[PDB]
Design a protein around this ligand. Structure first.
Ligand SMILES: OC[C@H]1O[C@@H](O[C@H]2[C@H](O)[C@@H](O)[C@H](O[C@H]3[C@H](O)[C@@H](O)[C@H](O[C@H]4[C@H](O)[C@@H](O)[C@H](O[C@H]5[C@H](O)[C@@H](O)[C@H](O[C@H]6[C@H](O)[C@@H](O)[C@@H](O)O[C@@H]6CO)O[C@@H]5CO)O[C@@H]4CO)O[C@@H]3CO)O[C@@H]2CO)[C@H](O)[C@@H](O)[C@@H]1O
Ligand code: CO
Length: 153
């Protein structure tokens, strides 16, 4: 048996929603520039992007992404069949991109990945380089595709 993780690059540079995903989000408008998904939540809506994998689910593992964000951002996953949600982490503000690699300890499969404006104050959120691994955060190695190019030596 192959014990290495499956890495799913959901998007690197975003110029729209990733192929294979719908947005079941709420209370926001999304724009795309400079390879970032830019979320502008509406004041008072506790808005979110909710990326819905149209075919299949993820299980456990970890989520990796670059984010900058004016306010706290709650990361959730959901199982749409059971309508069950799980808070992965709430991330504090940062005025520069930070790479996060977060364990997902939820014990149902998930088909929705949510980035939510936790304070409901309309703080903007920028996301790039979103990847799921079936392995742990401690075992996570960035996919070669995330490099600006890759010319193998
Ligand atoms: O169209 C495609 C598809 O749609 C299907 O229907 C989907 C729909 O598209 C989708 O949008 C919807 O998504 C749900 C999601 O499943 C829920 O988990 C989510 O729940 C939100 C909730 O809406 C928010 O109100 C709540 O907000 C919290 C906030 O997280 C928290 O930080 C805050 O606390 C405050 C507190 O209130 C203050 O007093 C003070 O203490 O400050 C704190 C912190 O600020 O409070 C907020 C308010 O309570 O967050 C939760 C969790 O994220 O809701 C969304 C939207 O409804 O899901 C449906 C499926 O059910 C169709 O079914 C399908 O046919 C169609 O094809
Ligand atoms: Co190589």
């Amino acid at each position: 048996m192959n014990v290495r993780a499956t890495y799913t690059v959901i998007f690197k540079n975003a110029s729209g929603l990733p192929n294979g995903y719908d947005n079941w989000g709420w209370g926001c408008t999304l724009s795309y520039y400079g390879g970032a998904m830019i979320i502008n939540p509406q004041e008072g809506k506790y808005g979110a992007v909710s990326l819905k994998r149209n075919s299949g689910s993820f299980r456990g593992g970890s989520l990796r992404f670059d984010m900058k964000n004016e306010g706290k951002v709650k990361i959730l996953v959901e199982n749409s069949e059971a309508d069950e949600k799980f808070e992965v982490e709430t991330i504090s503000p940062s005025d520069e991109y930070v790479t996060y690699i977060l364990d997902v300890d939820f014990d149902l499969p998930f088909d929705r990945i949510d980035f939510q404006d936790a304070p409901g104050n309309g703080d903007r959120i920028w996301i790039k380089n979103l990847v799921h691994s079936t392995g742990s955060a401690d075992d996570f190695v960035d996919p070669i595709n995330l490099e600006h190019h890759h010319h193998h030596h």
